[PDB]
Amino acid sequence: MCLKLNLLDHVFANPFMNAAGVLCSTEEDLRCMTASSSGALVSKSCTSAPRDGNPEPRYMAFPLGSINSMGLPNLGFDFYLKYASDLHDYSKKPLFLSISGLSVEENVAMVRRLAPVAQEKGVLLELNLSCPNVPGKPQVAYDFEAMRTYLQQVSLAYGLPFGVKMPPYFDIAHFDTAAAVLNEFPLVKFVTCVNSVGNGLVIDAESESVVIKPKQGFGGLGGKYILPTALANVNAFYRRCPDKLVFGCGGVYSGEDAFLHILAGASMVQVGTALQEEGPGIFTRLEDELLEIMARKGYRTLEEFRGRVKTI
Amino acid sequence: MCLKLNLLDHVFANPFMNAAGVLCSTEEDLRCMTASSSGALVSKSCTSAPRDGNPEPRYMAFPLGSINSMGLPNLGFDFYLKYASDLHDYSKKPLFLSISGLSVEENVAMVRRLAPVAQEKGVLLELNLSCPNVPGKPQVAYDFEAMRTYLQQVSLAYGLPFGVKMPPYFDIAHFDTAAAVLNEFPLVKFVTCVNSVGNGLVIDAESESVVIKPKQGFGGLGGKYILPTALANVNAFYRRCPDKLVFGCGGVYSGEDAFLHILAGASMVQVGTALQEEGPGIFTRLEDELLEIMARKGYRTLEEFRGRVKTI
């Protein structure tokens, strides 16, 4: 029995990694993720310049999940590029670098500089087209023309394999259109489904107040709230993009949740809210729990059940 | 202290009603809802002709909520119109009739015949622009040009006040556009937020199978999963449509959940999944629980706190 994967010309001890934004902003965070039992890690979505992000409080967790409006607080592209070039220990595990420019031009600027480092070191780009938290900036991939423009411009400027962090969709027509756009771009090798469920609103009954400060309380949802949405998106893109990989993200707290993502079609499985809440010890637990389910079912490898969800 | 309120030139004993589709398909169902302690009821979304709906199993409930792909099973508009015209006891509580044509023409056909009954009896139209479960029929109000066309044509053909059942949105730009479309139509007096969260996917780990048959397992989500999404939509439309009423729907299991909806801006509060699971006894519990919270806080009226959610 084993959790090993070999994909994108890299080897992974297991399918687990942090979700972008969680435990991955500082050098300390990245070293911590590297020291963990995760199979990989991804850095905080970055912008050209450092950002303070949105006003606090901007993250709150509850029994059923989280709400956040972080606002892309990050140390700036220069830092994450330097981490990938000079600091990351690739002998430990593969590194993904997430970018989330506020315009196509900003993304293009970053990828032009990332390309030689990706070539040399094998760092893998995750392009974030789904941030729901910057005021005045709607989710890029909810506008299919904008999505196409970003992918065209990034493909041309980068010229190397990359992946895309996608927002959740709720409409069959949108799964159809979004996947068709992705399929226009042969350099898009993986699709990460999903980013947080945008612009939810948590209200505290006692205080009669929203629980986060930015955007009048409106923030992205993660955790237990979003698992069926995440599974739907993973499966929708797994079915529609048979020549790409799908990475699952959303609502993973247990080996069983990971098992469901993998049944739906996930290769890598990312952990956001649950990792934020439990800390990096979660990775040993997820591995043990997934292996236990596999043992009970007689599955020896991930490929034996990946994408094998049954319909009625 | 009592929960009595007046809206749309009708008097309501309390703000609670069923969500369309739950306990409202047959004459038996409607008599049951009328006999309950709810402040109002709404009939099953109907089509011009009777429908069997999608193949079973098509509804499944879990601790965190429900998934459904009913497919508009209904007895046909003729029946619901007859119920409104001949059978409903308006002395008990107000009646809403929901319609969900599969085209603008079909909705127009229904509203032309509803009009005289609305004039005579005061039945209230809820136009469903958000069914996420009929194969090959995407949610109307995710297509803003289609939404405008439906509202223009229904407004012209009906000529009387009505309301609209809206899908959940997840994007500030979409709240902005959707509310602006609604504000073009003075006959739209209420906005019901939200219909089920479309095209989620629940998978059973033991059987490795989806849990509903239609559409390869993809169905609308209700219940605990969707409360922050529902609150966000209620509040977004409450803020953007200051001259209309907003009805809250989504994730109501308790008087506290109802309190949150009302804080967010809800006038009426609809109950779907929790009512499907618990039965019509839920309405006495919801009323008792809401009154208790109000008493603890020193609120004497719903008006004292409706829409008064605090921001930071």
Ligand SMILES: Cc1cc2nc3c(=O)[nH]c(=O)nc-3n(C[C@H](O)[C@H](O)[C@H](O)COP(=O)(O)O)c2cc1C
């Ligand atoms: C604290 C916070 C910060 C996040 N930052 C990013 C980000 O930088 N880039 C990104 O693509 N997603 C970001 N996300 C979204 C997560 O990567 C993930 O898609 C989402 O939280 C759903 O997964 P979950 O249910 O495991 O939380 C963030 C989420 C949270 C909780």
Ligand SMILES: Cc1cc2nc3c(=O)[nH]c(=O)nc-3n(C[C@H](O)[C@H](O)[C@H](O)COP(=O)(O)O)c2cc1C
């Ligand atoms: C069994 C089932 C059938 C439904 N049928 C309709 C329908 O006919 N028309 C409609 O507007 N909404 C329908 N809905 C959606 C509900 O009215 C409601 O918007 C949704 O379930 C969210 O509320 P909840 O969290 O209380 O379940 C249905 C929901 C379920 C559970």
Ligand SMILES: O=C1NC(=O)NC(C(=O)O)N1
């Ligand atoms: O892509 C993102 N997803 C989130 O949930 N939060 C952020 C962020 O605001 O940093 N970005």
Ligand SMILES: O=C1NC(=O)NC(C(=O)O)N1
């Ligand atoms: O508008 C609807 N919402 C739902 O959740 N289900 C249905 C239905 O399929 O009958 N219709």
